[PDB]
C-alpha cells in the first residue's frame, strides 16, 4: 500500500506489456518498476511500486 499506488487514470491496453508499464509509468507516474495487474473490469490497472513489490 505505502509502496503501492494505483493509477486508475492510466489503464491502457498498451500496458499489457510489462515493458510499457514500467517505462510508461516512469515517464508518467515516475514509478520505479510500474507494475500492472488485472482487475475485475478485466482492465490493466497501473500500480506504481516504490522499491517494495
UniProtKB/Swiss-Prot annotation:
Principal subcellular localisation of the protein: secreted
A single BP term in Gene Ontology: defense response to bacterium
Cysteine disulfide partners in this protein: 3-51, 15-36, 21-46, 25-48
One GO cellular component term noted in the UniProt record for this chain: extracellular region
Entry's localization field: Secreted
UniProt keyword annotation of Disulfide bond present: yes
Secretion signal, residue range per the UniProt entry: none
Superkingdom of the organism of origin: Eukaryota
InterPro entries, A to Z: Scorpion_toxin-like_sf
Subunit structure: Monomer.
Family of the protein in this entry: Belongs to the DEFL family.
Name listed for the protein in its UniProt record: Defensin-like protein
Organism: Pentadiplandra brazzeana
Native organism taxonomy: Eukaryota, Viridiplantae, Streptophyta, Embryophyta, Tracheophyta
Amino acid at each position: 500500500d505505502k509502496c503501492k499506488k494505483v493509477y486508475e487514470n492510466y489503464p491502457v491496453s498498451k500496458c499489457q506489456l510489462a515493458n510499457q508499464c514500467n517505462y510508461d509509468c516512469k515517464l508518467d507516474k515516475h514509478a520505479r518498476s510500474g507494475e500492472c495487474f488485472y482487475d475485475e473490469k478485466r482492465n490493466l490497472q497501473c500500480i506504481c511500486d516504490y522499491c517494495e513489490y
